[PDB]
Amino acid sequence: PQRVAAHITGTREKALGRKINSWESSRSGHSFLSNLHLRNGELVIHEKGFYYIYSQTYFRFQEEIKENTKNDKQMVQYIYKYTSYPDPILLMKSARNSCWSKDAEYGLYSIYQGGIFELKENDRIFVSVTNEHLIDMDHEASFFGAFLVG
Amino acid sequence: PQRVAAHITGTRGEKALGRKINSWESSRSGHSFLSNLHLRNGELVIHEKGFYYIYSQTYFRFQEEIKENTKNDKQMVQYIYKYTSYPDPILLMKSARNSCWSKDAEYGLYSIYQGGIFELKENDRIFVSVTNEHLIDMDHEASFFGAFLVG
Amino acid sequence: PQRVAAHITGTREKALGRKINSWESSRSGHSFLSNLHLRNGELVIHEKGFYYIYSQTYFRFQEEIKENTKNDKQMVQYIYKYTSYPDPILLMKSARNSCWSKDAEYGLYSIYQGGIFELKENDRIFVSVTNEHLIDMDHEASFFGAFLV
Amino acid sequence: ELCPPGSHRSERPGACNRCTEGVGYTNASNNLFACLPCTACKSDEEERSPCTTTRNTACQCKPGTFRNDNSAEMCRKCSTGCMVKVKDCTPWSDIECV
Amino acid sequence: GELCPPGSHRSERPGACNRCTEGVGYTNASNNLFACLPCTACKSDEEERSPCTTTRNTACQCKPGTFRNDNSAEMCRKCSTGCPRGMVKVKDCTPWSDIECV
Amino acid sequence: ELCPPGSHRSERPGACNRCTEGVGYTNASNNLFACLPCTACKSDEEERSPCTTTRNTACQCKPGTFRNDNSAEMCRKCSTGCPRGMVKVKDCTPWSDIECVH
Ligand SMILES: [Cl-]
Ligand SMILES: [Zn+2]
């Protein structure tokens, strides 16, 4: 197991949004950690290198027409890193807005993003989202992972 | 030749949700390929046990004519399943989109991409299943399916 | 040392859309090039092989309707390659349409796609988009990369 | 040969571990290294029966809404009108119009 | 000169050329591609002007009443009925452009 | 082994490079190999203070709009009224919608 990778799934500071901290790590066949570990919803790096980091967050909601406001929701997924620096550093953001139509009965918005980043040993990576209360934490729907590329 | 990966694309020709896409194309050098994996009934078959980053993009493309009015609301879901040594297919990933609720909507363009890492055993089969299969655009560059060994 | 990968981010021909040529490649920790190089917004291949290629393009716009016609937008991300052939070859396309509701005050549409492609030494890969004027070039928002698989 | 429903296989070639009630399950004899995660009923559904080590949760759309083969994610409100209504809507189908 | 003619691509065999399959793929120029380019399919909103040949991709065009501009390459859009208040129609709509107002 | 605010670490183990004013910055002592990129104010915002080698840009929503914790990307128009059964205790700010009580 000289393999450096992880895939963790949903379970039922100066950073934007709210950190997802309810990830599940070891159901054989569904999620796993190989030469990385989880701490307070943050994936911790062991081996310095280039990592392809990705995350899918499912915004799922039934909506009731807001009487004095628009039914507009900004669904944003943020991927941050904590390094040898006091503030978390934004690596990636992916945004979506819900349907402006007042005829809207519900919303299904899965957001996936990924990219390659150089990380140092003991750097921590986490996912932060807006509207955390609309997130569906089904294992197959919302997840977070990384693997060593270089 | 010791490379374990595949990228198969669209072509116009059980207890699982949605309907399995079975019209994928494997050869055509530069556009699709199979290296140490094979295709059978639209399912990618694993040869080497390991950690695989699996992904798929499915393009939902349609012209819509609102009449009388409802129910034109569409749930566009992409499911990625695996068949292992177990009677039922096991869901690995799902990604969903709903169409625009506006009555002014003339058409819909909804590309869905998802990917993730999964441990697979030799002879495990992976496939893509979607809702509204009749709205899928199978252009090679638009809808595709693939995987590669990470560990 | 022998790592073949790149991740380049935004800075503020017969191909569809318009080529993004304003990528940055040298910010340590944010963007990099390892055994690939950038030229006119195109990533150039050094080592022949299978590459997982990906891109995220952020369409962000504030746009209040104008009392007449429809403001319906087709947001398309194209990933092309230039090889030993006169025309660019489309590898991937990902499309989204904006919200048709006339109550729409703005649009936030991030588009991500990726896939594996066999590339030859000196093949060039680039990103082209429709509505280039609506693209937000924040470094965490729009980016382009690849790595040898 | 196989681990019974409500169990999965362990590292030791001939041993079976029981699934955790309410967390995971297995509906058939198997050799999986983990039980399958239980399904959660969403806010638009009602739970008909809970998850057991041998049966996944069984959910059904709330009255007035339905779900079908092409709408597996969210329950949809049943159509108010039609053509004449030959059949009423069910948790698994909209109204039938003749 | 190590280039295969239009209607053909380079083979696995270093010195050979394979012909494209009519209706399936093509190549418009001399090349050394390992596969011919896939033919384009006209979508439900388009009409086929000319079919795919081993040397020419299919030619599609928006159906009458609709168009496709540089920023709307995916789906044909309905042509605008009129010009806004105080503007006159200088040009009629084409399969490649909406009405021009000035 | 830490560079001061307004600077980051170099390749040379003991050196510090200064951030480029208007391009990047660093707010604390550090050993980053690059300064953090400056934020750009978008069309819906106004710049309160520019980016300096030690402070990121400070933007603010344009009058009549706001940005809060659940709407960090685009400024939203302030709500006209309070929901069913609620009064209006606080007016909207560039960082918050109207406050409603009861
Ligand atoms: Cl919409
Ligand atoms: Zn909409």
Structural domains of chain E, ranges and CATH numbers in brackets: 1-37 (2.10.50.10), 38-77 (2.10.50.10)
Taking Cα atoms as reference points, which of C89, C91, C56, C76 lies closest to residue C130? C76
> Distance between CA atoms of E96 and B144, rounded to whole angstroms?
29
Rounded to a whole number of angstroms, the distance between the first and last alpha carbons of chain B is 17
Q: Are F47 and F62 in contact (CB under 8 A)?
A: no
Does B68 sit behind a cis peptide bond, omega within 30 degrees of 0 on the bond before it? Answer: yes
Which helix (H) or strand (E) segment holds residue F53: the answer is none
Listed residue (D6, D66, D1, D81) closest to D36, CA to CA: D6
Q: C138 with C10: CB under 8 angstroms?
A: yes
Which is nearest to E24 in space by CA: E8, E37, E43? Answer: E37
> In angstroms, what CA-CA distances link C22 with C8, C135, C138, E85, F92?
10, 11, 11, 39, 38
Instruction: Note whether A48 and A82 are within 8 A (CB).
Output: no
Torsion, Cα E71 E74 E79 E85, to 10 degrees, reads -40
CB B63 to CB E75 under 8 A?
yes
Query: In whole angstroms, what is the distance from residue C134 CA to residue C108 CA?
Result: 10
Identify whether the C-beta of residue A89 lies closer than 8 Å to the C-beta of residue A81. Answer: yes
Q: Return the bridge partners of C51, or none.
A: C117, C148
What value does the CA radius of gyration of chain A take, rounded to a whole number of Å? 16
As to burial, measured by CB atoms within 10 angstroms (0-12 exposed, 13-18 middle, 19+ buried), residue D34 is: middle
* Dihedral (CA of A82, A36, C55, B127) sign: negative
Ligand in nearest proximity to the CA of B98: 1
The CA distances from residue C135 to C20, C22, C130, in Å, are: 10, 11, 9
Resolution (angstroms) stands at 3.0
Q: Between the CA of residue B2 and those of B5, B29, D47, what are the distances in Å? A: 10, 18, 49
Of B33, B100, B111, the CB nearest to C99: B100
Instruction: Report the alpha-carbon distance of residue C114 to residue A131 in Å, rounded.
Output: 27
Minimum Cα–Cα distance from A49: chain C residue: C3
Method in brief: X-ray
DSSP state of F17: E
The three-state secondary structure class of C132 is: helix
**Which of B90, B97, B150 has its CB closest to that of A147?**
B150
Number of residue pairs across C and F with CB atoms under 8 Å? 27
Among the listed residues C124, B131, B61, the one whose alpha carbon sits nearest the alpha carbon of residue D73: B131
Q: In Å, what is the CA distance from D35 to each residue of B121, C40, D10, D12?
A: 16, 52, 11, 16
Q: Per residue, what are the HEC states of B87-148?
A: CCCEEEEEEEEECCCCCCCCEEEEEEEEEEEEEECCCCEEEEEECCHHHEECCCCCCEEEEE
Distance of CA A92 to the CA centre of its chain: 10
Alpha carbon distance, N-terminus to C-terminus of chain C = 16
Q: C136: distance to nearest CA of chain F, Å?
A: 9
DSSP class of residue F84 equals: T
Report residue B75 as tokens.
Answer: 């749930």
Residues C138, A129 contacting (CB under 8 angstroms): no
A142 annotated as ligand-binding: no
Q: F66 and F97 in contact (C-beta within 8 Å)?
A: yes
Four-CA torsion C9, C10, C13, C15, nearest 10 degrees: 70
Partners of E37 in the β-ladder? E26
Count the residues in chain D: 98
In angstroms, the CA A26 to CA A38 distance is 11
Q: How far apart are CA F36 and CA F26, in angstroms?
A: 6
How far, CA to CA in Å, does C133 sit from each of A111, C10, C41, C137, F16? 23, 14, 17, 10, 38
Interface-testing mutation among C65, C71, C73, C74, with chain E (most E C-beta atoms within 10 A): C74
Q: How far apart are CA C101 and CA A102, in angstroms?
A: 9
Q: CA-nearest residue of chain E to B136?
A: E43
**CA atoms of E95 and E76, how far apart (whole Å):** 8
Q: Chain C: which residues have CB within 8 Å of chain F?
A: 12, 27-30, 60, 62, 105-106, 108, 136, 138-139
How many other β-carbons are positioned within 10 Å of the β-carbon of residue C44?
Answer: 17
Q: How far apart are CA B104 and CA F85, in angstroms?
A: 33
Nearest C-alpha neighbor of E68 from the set E59, E58, E78: E78
> ∠ CA(D63), CA(D69), CA(D74), 5° rounding?
45
Question: Which of E45, E20, E54, E46 has its CA nearest to residue E35?
Answer: E20
Residue E5, φ and ψ in degrees, nearest 5: -75, 165
Contact of B79 with A96, CB cutoff 8 Å: no
Q: What is residue B135's DSSP assignment?
A: G
DSSP string, A89-142: EEEEEEEEE----TT--EEEEEEEEEEEEEE-TT-EEEEEESSGGGEE--TTTS
The CB density around residue D27, as the number of other CB atoms within 10 Å, is: 17
* DSSP type of residue C48: -
Pick the ligand that lies closest to the CA of residue A104.
Answer: 2
Q: Are A43 and A98 in contact (CB under 8 A)?
A: no
Residue with tokens 């398309």: C76
Position of tokens 């078959």? B45
**Cα C99 to averaged position of ligand 1 atoms, centre (Å):** 4
Burial state string for C11-31 with b = 16 or more CB within 10 A and e = fewer than 16 = beeeebbbbbeebbbebebbb
CA of A129 to the centre of ligand 2 (A): 22
Nearest to F74 among C12, C29, C106 (CB): C106
CA distances from E42 to B137, E39, E46, E82 (A): 11, 10, 6, 29
How long a stretch of residues is chain F?
A: 102
Q: Name the DSSP class of E36.
A: P
CA of C106 to the centre of ligand 1 (A): 11
Backbone angles phi, psi at D54, to 5 degrees: -120, -10
- Chain C hits for B7, CB-CB cut-off 8 Å, are 115-117
Partners of residue C100 in chain B, C-beta under 8 Å: 100, 102, 104-106
Verify whether the Cβ–Cβ distance A16 to F82 is below 8 Å.
no
Q: How far is the CA of B102 from the centre of ligand 1 (A)?
A: 7
How many Cα atoms are found within 13 Å in the side-chain-facing hemisphere of B78?
A: 26
Say yes or no for a CB contact (<8 Å) between A99 and B95. Answer: no
List the single best residue of B71, B78, B81 to mutate versus D (max D Cβ within 10 A): B71
Q: How many angstroms away from the CA of A33 is the closest CA of chain B?
A: 11
The gap between the terminal CA atoms of chain F, to the nearest Å, is 55
The two three-digit tokens of residue C44, written as one number: 């150039």
Among the partner-chain residues C32, C105, C110, the one whose CB lies closest to the CB of A96 is: C110
- Whether F and A touch, i.e. at least 3 CB pairs below 8 A, reads as yes
Interchain CB contact of E44 with B (< 8 Å): yes
Alpha-carbon torsion angle D18, D21, D26, D28, nearest 10: 80
Q: Which of F58, F27, F28 is nearest to F41 (CA)?
A: F58
Give the integer Cα–Cα distance in Å for E5 and F86: 76
CA distance B48 to chain C (A): 16
Do B106 and E45 count as a contact with CB atoms less than 8 A apart? no
Q: Which domains does chain A have, with CATH numbers?
A: 1-150 (2.60.120.40)
In the block, residue with structure tokens 């796993």: A32
